[PDB]
């Protein structure tokens, strides 16, 4: 069975949380997901294999902090440098250098390719859920655990969250009454996350959520506001954001996109991000 | 003051040491308890919030509304998000949802439902007469005092008790109590909040009391969101209920809000208007609240 984390792990502050292994002082990242009084344990134990990939935060264990008056704690490796969303927020002009966006986007795609190959959909790709280590490595938070929880109807799948990263196919309407979706929905999210890095927020961020939900299936694909960006960047965004998912490139195709595939300054970019992380952290 | 955005220092304080989490607080000058919802805000969020305060209407205290005491900013260091405090009268006897959950069988007698529903409509009438829409009527946002008073949640610019599932103004929320007109759908491109949306939610809340859950509780939220504008209005599953109750439900849940009754008309509906056992009901509610604290 799954334990209560007391005396094993404790929450420090939020970043997903900074958590601490109580007995050893080792740090961990803790994804807190409310849950309903078993088979949670089972899925985690199937999926945890997958978290070993370098671009996914490795699973440490899982715990539930009971109870009515429940909460799942997904414990994973600590990424000291915080989320890419915090990075952009703490960056002047709320925008990252294009070649930083190329590096980070590729790392996200490598992590996703790993899940997708094994028929896992992440379902929650956004800047908030992509973390950085001190050495500026890029790791996805979660690896299908929250995806499985969003499946079950019940008292802990009663809310619709933010719509800004949702692909068109995820949003029901009369020609799409069953909100049919697959792994390619994660790639639309990656595109939205790339804009997030470029502009500081996803498109439609200033719109009422309900209205954004209405506009996504009906508006053309979002584009970068500014023309300062390269043709290759615009092209990468276009690929992530193919309106009809049936024609959207897969993860392996996007990994071959010139924006992603050709990064002659990688070593330097990592060095720049590392320094930027230091200068900008709060 | 319900129109300025001050530091809460020396006006309100937390007594009990999460985003949108509600804490027990205290009015500094009078010692009167309060419920304090605390939220991180960026600098930009602070401008948005100032604007929403200008948009707020003026209305008096009301026995069926948990008094909104105002909005405040708790300063954090430069580079760090400040805190928004939304301050409300303290109601210590839980929500109507807690009430249902603590009732054996998770269901309420019909005369309890009439009583509570009436109190809800009275709060709503006060808001509506003042050109205010509540926007979030559900069992969770209707509170009890230790005196068994029924009070609508009012955090001013926010209408919910539980912690916001995401950053303010960025999440869709739970769809179950939403009227059709507030759901953007193929035929409703401009999601209408109208005062009558609260009356639909009121109807849903009465089913919530009668059955323990809102209609469509067996659907994933996104599927429910799709269904609500498309389905005919929901109904009570059981036939055990009085004709009056069925008629009240049907009154609240008129599909087209333009053809749905006003609060004043619903307050005259026999199910609401004729409560021969209300004195007993209140007594019964108070005993229930007493038993529970034990
Ligand atoms: Na890993």
Swiss-Prot record, chain A:
Where does the record place the Protein kinase domain?
Answer: 9-260
Q: Say which family it is in.
A: Belongs to the protein kinase superfamily. STE Ser/Thr protein kinase family. STE20 subfamily.
Where is it localised? Answer: Cytoplasm
What is this protein's function per UniProt?
Serine/threonine kinase that plays a role in the response to environmental stress and cytokines such as TNF-alpha. Appears to act upstream of the JUN N-terminal pathway. Activator of the Hippo signaling pathway which plays a pivotal role in organ size control and tumor suppression by restricting proliferation and promoting apoptosis. MAP4Ks act in parallel to and are partially redundant with STK3/MST2 and STK4/MST2 in the phosphorylation and activation of LATS1/2, and establish MAP4Ks as components of the expanded Hippo pathway.
Tissue localization of expression? Widely expressed. Isoform 5 is abundant in the brain. Isoform 4 is predominant in the liver, skeletal muscle and placenta.
Q: What is this protein called?
A: Mitogen-activated protein kinase kinase kinase kinase 4
Q: How does it assemble?
A: Interacts with the SH3 domain of the adapter proteins Nck. Interacts (via its CNH regulatory domain) with ATL1 (via the N-terminal region). Interacts with RAP2A (GTP-bound form preferentially).
Catalytic machinery residues: 124
Q: Which domain of life is it from?
A: Eukaryota
- Which organism encodes this protein? Homo sapiens
Q: Which residues bind ATP?
A: 31
């Amino acid at each position: 069975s799954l334990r209560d984390p007391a005396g094993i792990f404790e929450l420090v502050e939020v970043v997903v949380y900074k958590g601490r292994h109580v007995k050893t002082g080792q740090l961990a990242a803790i994804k807190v997901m409310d849950v309903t009084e078993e088979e949670i344990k089972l899925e985690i134990n199937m999926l945890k294999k997958y978290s070993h990939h370098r671009n996914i935060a490795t699973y440490y264990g899982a715990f539930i902090k009971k109870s009515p008056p429940d909460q799942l704690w997904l414990v994973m490796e600590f990424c000291g440098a915080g989320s890419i969303t915090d990075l952009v927020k703490n960056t002047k002009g709320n925008t990252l250098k294009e070649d930083w966006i190329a590096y980070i986007s590729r790392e996200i795609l490598r992590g996703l390719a790993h899940l997708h190959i094994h028929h896992v959909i992440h379902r929650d790709i956004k800047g908030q859920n992509v973390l950085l280590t001190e050495n500026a490595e890029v790791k996805l938070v979660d690896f299908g655990v929250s995806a499985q929880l969003d499946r079950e109807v019940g008292r802990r799948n009663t809310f619709i969250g933010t719509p800004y990263w949702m692909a068109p196919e995820v949003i029901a309407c009369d020609e799409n009454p069953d909100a049919t979706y697959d792994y390619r929905s994660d790639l639309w999210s990656c595109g939205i996350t790339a804009i997030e890095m470029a502009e500081g927020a996803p498109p439609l961020c200033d719109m009422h959520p309900m209205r954004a939900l209405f506009l996504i299936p009906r508006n053309p694909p979002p584009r970068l506001k500014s023309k300062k960006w390269s043709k290759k960047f615009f092209s990468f965004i276009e690929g992530c954001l193919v309106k009809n998912y049936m024609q959207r490139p897969s993860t392996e195709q996007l990994l071959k996109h010139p924006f992603i595939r050709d990064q002659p300054n990688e070593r330097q970019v990592r060095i720049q991000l590392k320094d930027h992380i230091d200068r900008t952290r709060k």
